[PDB]
Every structure is written in C-alpha cells, then in structure tokens.
Coordinates of C-alpha atoms and ligand atoms in Angstrom, one line a residue:
Chain Z
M1 CA -7.9 41.4 -152.7
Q2 CA -7.9 38.0 -151.0
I3 CA -6.8 37.5 -147.4
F4 CA -6.9 34.5 -145.0
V5 CA -8.0 34.2 -141.4
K6 CA -6.8 31.3 -139.3
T7 CA -7.7 30.2 -135.8
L8 CA -5.4 27.7 -134.0
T9 CA -7.5 24.7 -134.9
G10 CA -10.2 25.5 -137.4
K11 CA -10.3 25.5 -141.2
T12 CA -9.0 28.6 -142.8
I13 CA -11.4 31.1 -144.2
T14 CA -11.0 33.4 -147.2
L15 CA -12.1 37.1 -147.2
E16 CA -12.4 39.7 -150.0
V17 CA -11.1 43.0 -148.7
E18 CA -9.6 46.3 -149.9
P19 CA -6.6 48.1 -148.4
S20 CA -8.9 50.9 -147.2
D21 CA -11.0 48.5 -145.0
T22 CA -10.6 49.1 -141.3
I23 CA -9.8 46.2 -138.9
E24 CA -13.4 46.7 -137.7
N25 CA -14.7 46.2 -141.3
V26 CA -12.7 43.0 -141.5
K27 CA -14.3 41.9 -138.2
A28 CA -17.7 42.7 -139.7
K29 CA -16.9 40.5 -142.7
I30 CA -15.9 37.7 -140.3
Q31 CA -19.2 38.2 -138.5
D32 CA -21.0 37.8 -141.8
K33 CA -19.0 34.7 -142.7
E34 CA -19.1 33.0 -139.2
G35 CA -21.6 34.8 -136.9
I36 CA -18.9 35.9 -134.4
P37 CA -19.6 39.4 -133.0
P38 CA -16.7 41.9 -133.6
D39 CA -16.2 42.5 -129.8
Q40 CA -15.4 38.9 -129.3
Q41 CA -12.6 39.0 -132.0
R42 CA -8.9 39.7 -131.7
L43 CA -7.0 39.9 -135.0
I44 CA -3.2 39.3 -135.1
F45 CA -0.6 39.8 -137.8
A46 CA 3.2 39.2 -137.7
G47 CA 3.6 40.0 -134.0
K48 CA 0.9 42.8 -133.7
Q49 CA -2.6 42.8 -132.4
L50 CA -4.4 44.9 -135.0
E51 CA -6.5 47.9 -133.8
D52 CA -10.1 48.4 -134.8
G53 CA -9.7 52.0 -136.1
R54 CA -6.6 51.4 -138.3
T55 CA -6.7 50.1 -141.9
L56 CA -5.2 47.1 -143.6
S57 CA -3.1 49.8 -145.5
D58 CA -1.8 51.3 -142.2
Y59 CA -0.2 47.9 -141.4
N60 CA 0.9 47.3 -145.0
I61 CA -1.0 44.1 -145.1
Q62 CA -0.7 42.8 -148.6
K63 CA -2.6 40.3 -150.8
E64 CA -2.8 36.7 -149.6
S65 CA -1.7 37.7 -146.1
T66 CA -2.9 35.5 -143.2
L67 CA -4.4 37.1 -140.1
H68 CA -4.8 35.1 -136.9
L69 CA -8.1 35.2 -135.0
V70 CA -8.4 34.5 -131.3
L71 CA -11.7 34.7 -129.5
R72 CA -12.4 36.4 -126.2
Chain R
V1 CA 22.0 53.2 -128.8
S2 CA 24.4 52.6 -125.9
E3 CA 25.8 49.3 -124.5
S4 CA 24.3 50.1 -121.0
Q5 CA 20.8 50.8 -122.3
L6 CA 21.2 47.5 -124.4
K7 CA 22.0 45.4 -121.3
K8 CA 18.9 46.8 -119.7
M9 CA 16.5 46.0 -122.5
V10 CA 17.7 42.3 -122.4
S11 CA 17.7 42.0 -118.6
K12 CA 15.1 39.2 -118.7
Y13 CA 17.0 37.1 -121.2
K14 CA 18.4 33.8 -120.0
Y15 CA 21.7 34.5 -122.0
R16 CA 22.1 38.2 -121.6
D17 CA 25.9 38.5 -122.2
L18 CA 25.7 36.4 -125.5
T19 CA 22.7 38.4 -126.8
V20 CA 24.3 41.7 -126.0
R21 CA 27.6 40.9 -127.7
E22 CA 26.0 39.5 -130.9
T23 CA 23.8 42.6 -131.0
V24 CA 26.7 45.0 -130.6
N25 CA 28.6 43.2 -133.4
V26 CA 25.6 43.5 -135.7
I27 CA 24.8 47.2 -135.2
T28 CA 28.5 48.1 -135.4
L29 CA 28.5 46.9 -139.0
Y30 CA 24.8 47.6 -139.8
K31 CA 24.2 51.1 -138.5
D32 CA 20.6 51.4 -139.8
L33 CA 19.5 48.5 -137.5
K34 CA 18.6 49.4 -133.9
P35 CA 17.6 47.4 -130.8
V36 CA 14.1 48.0 -129.5
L37 CA 12.0 46.4 -126.8
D38 CA 8.3 45.7 -127.7
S39 CA 5.6 43.2 -126.9
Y40 CA 5.3 40.4 -129.5
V41 CA 1.8 38.9 -129.7
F42 CA 1.9 35.4 -130.9
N43 CA -0.7 33.8 -133.1
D44 CA -2.4 32.2 -130.1
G45 CA -2.9 35.6 -128.5
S46 CA -0.3 35.3 -125.8
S47 CA 2.2 38.1 -125.5
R48 CA 5.9 38.6 -124.5
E49 CA 8.2 41.6 -124.3
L50 CA 11.0 40.8 -126.7
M51 CA 14.0 42.8 -127.9
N52 CA 14.1 43.1 -131.7
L53 CA 16.4 44.6 -134.3
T54 CA 14.5 47.0 -136.6
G55 CA 15.7 49.1 -139.5
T56 CA 17.1 48.4 -143.0
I57 CA 19.9 46.4 -144.5
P58 CA 21.7 47.4 -147.7
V59 CA 21.1 45.1 -150.7
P60 CA 22.7 45.9 -154.0
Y61 CA 20.5 45.1 -157.0
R62 CA 20.8 46.0 -160.7
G63 CA 23.3 48.9 -159.9
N64 CA 21.2 50.5 -157.1
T65 CA 21.2 50.0 -153.3
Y66 CA 17.9 49.0 -151.8
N67 CA 17.5 49.5 -148.1
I68 CA 15.2 46.7 -147.1
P69 CA 13.3 47.2 -143.9
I70 CA 13.4 44.1 -141.6
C71 CA 12.6 43.1 -138.1
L72 CA 14.5 40.4 -136.3
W73 CA 12.7 39.4 -133.1
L74 CA 14.9 37.5 -130.5
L75 CA 13.1 35.0 -128.3
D76 CA 14.2 35.0 -124.6
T77 CA 16.1 31.8 -125.3
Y78 CA 18.4 33.6 -127.8
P79 CA 20.9 32.6 -129.1
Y80 CA 19.8 28.9 -128.9
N81 CA 16.7 29.4 -131.1
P82 CA 16.7 31.5 -134.3
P83 CA 15.2 35.0 -134.6
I84 CA 11.7 35.4 -136.0
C85 CA 12.4 37.4 -139.1
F86 CA 10.2 39.7 -141.3
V87 CA 10.4 42.0 -144.2
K88 CA 8.4 45.1 -143.3
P89 CA 7.3 46.7 -146.5
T90 CA 6.4 50.4 -146.5
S91 CA 3.6 52.0 -148.6
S92 CA 5.9 52.3 -151.6
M93 CA 6.9 48.6 -151.5
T94 CA 5.2 45.4 -152.5
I95 CA 6.3 42.0 -151.3
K96 CA 7.4 39.8 -154.1
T97 CA 6.6 36.4 -152.6
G98 CA 8.9 33.5 -153.3
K99 CA 11.2 30.9 -151.9
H100 CA 12.4 33.2 -149.1
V101 CA 9.5 35.5 -148.3
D102 CA 5.8 34.7 -147.9
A103 CA 2.8 37.1 -148.3
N104 CA 3.2 38.2 -144.6
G105 CA 6.8 39.1 -145.0
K106 CA 8.1 36.1 -143.1
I107 CA 11.6 35.2 -144.1
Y108 CA 12.8 31.6 -145.0
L109 CA 16.4 30.7 -145.2
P110 CA 18.6 27.6 -144.7
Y111 CA 20.4 29.6 -142.0
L112 CA 17.2 29.7 -139.9
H113 CA 16.2 26.1 -140.5
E114 CA 19.7 24.8 -139.6
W115 CA 20.3 27.3 -136.7
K116 CA 22.8 26.2 -134.0
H117 CA 24.8 28.2 -131.6
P118 CA 27.6 29.0 -131.6
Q119 CA 28.2 28.6 -135.4
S120 CA 25.0 30.6 -136.2
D121 CA 24.8 34.2 -135.2
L122 CA 23.0 37.5 -136.0
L123 CA 25.8 38.9 -138.1
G124 CA 26.0 35.6 -140.1
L125 CA 22.2 35.7 -140.6
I126 CA 22.3 39.2 -141.9
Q127 CA 25.0 38.7 -144.4
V128 CA 23.2 35.5 -145.8
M129 CA 20.1 37.6 -146.0
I130 CA 21.9 40.2 -148.1
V131 CA 23.4 37.5 -150.4
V132 CA 20.0 35.8 -150.9
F133 CA 18.0 39.0 -151.3
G134 CA 20.6 40.3 -153.8
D135 CA 19.8 37.4 -156.2
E136 CA 16.1 37.0 -155.2
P137 CA 14.7 40.5 -154.2
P138 CA 11.9 40.2 -151.7
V139 CA 10.4 43.6 -152.6
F140 CA 9.7 45.9 -155.5
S141 CA 9.1 49.7 -155.6
Ligands
LIG201 CU1 -23.1 41.7 -140.7
LIG202 CU1 16.8 31.0 -153.1

C-alpha cells in the first residue's frame, strides 16, 4: 500500500509499504529514498511518535496515511 | 471517572472550570467516553500534555448500532479553539475516507470550522458527529 511522509517544509514523498512493516523498516525505506540515517529520524502520526519496534498494523495506519518526519 | 480527578487532569488549562463542566456534561450522556491525560506530539515534533476524551460514540446505521472509536484532544486554550478530532479504527475496521474523515482518521465538520464559544461545545460536537456519521459512515467492518 501507498503512504506519504511530510516534513514541515519539503516536498512530500511516497513510499510503498505493507502493514507488517516495522517503523524501523519504514525508516530504512526513507533512508533508501533520501539518504537520511534511521537514527536521525522521528516519525509522527496523529499525535503519536511512532516506536521503531512496532508495526504500521499496531498503530492501525491505513492506506494513503501521512506520517510526519522530523530530523534530530 | 470522578469530578475531583477530572479537575486535577486539567489543572494546567487556562479555563479549567469551563472545560470541566463541558466534559462532565459529555460523559454524563456518553458513558463510553472517558477523560485521559496524555502527551500529544505535534507534527513539528513538539509535545504537550493534553486531556483527551477517548472511547466510542453510538451511531445507528442500517438497523445496527456501531460504536465508533474516537479521540477528542482539547488544547490548553479549550474552549476557545476546537478539539482535534480523530476516528481511531481498530484491526477490524477500515476508514472509509470521504468528506468528513481523511486517511489518517482526522474529522472534518462545519461545527469545527465555525467553532465559537459559548455556542459551540463538546456535547454539541458529539451530537453533530453522530448525525453526520449516521448518513456518511466513516468506517466499515
Ligand atoms: Cu538502505
Ligand atoms: Cu457530509
């Protein structure tokens, strides 16, 4: 499924993911798309900072969702 | 639970008495909503401890009653700015995006866009939600 990742200022970027992907896996996909190391990434969804070990499924993040990225 | 516990969780709110009263009135009618204090992390990565109402609201549809999970986050300027409102789907629910709910579960209603105290309140919001969601369901099984 498709999701979006926005920073405050930048262009949005699109990612292909599955519900089983961990937040870490998403960070690794962002690293492949943008070069940013996972440990410099914070991902945020609807009031929550997402935790590396949990999955998109655990947060019930559905298709076309937007995650917000802020950098250390 | 408890009016005393409630006053404590909103201790840092600029308008404590107003927030407490609106909240009591809501949970008196809507017993599966409950007040909770949690940190909300905004899209810019900043964080604030906010009181939210969390639970379900009953929405009749097609002969059945769907208990839709929501979260209503109150900013510390409540009631002068509207709640941030979300549908919170469970593993058995899919968001049906549309005019009033986006892919993230964020809720959109005229009541929120035109929010103005004292005419707008939590109870008013919830009943509008129930009317709108009864015609335009935001989830499916
Ligand atoms: Cu890589
Ligand atoms: Cu409508």
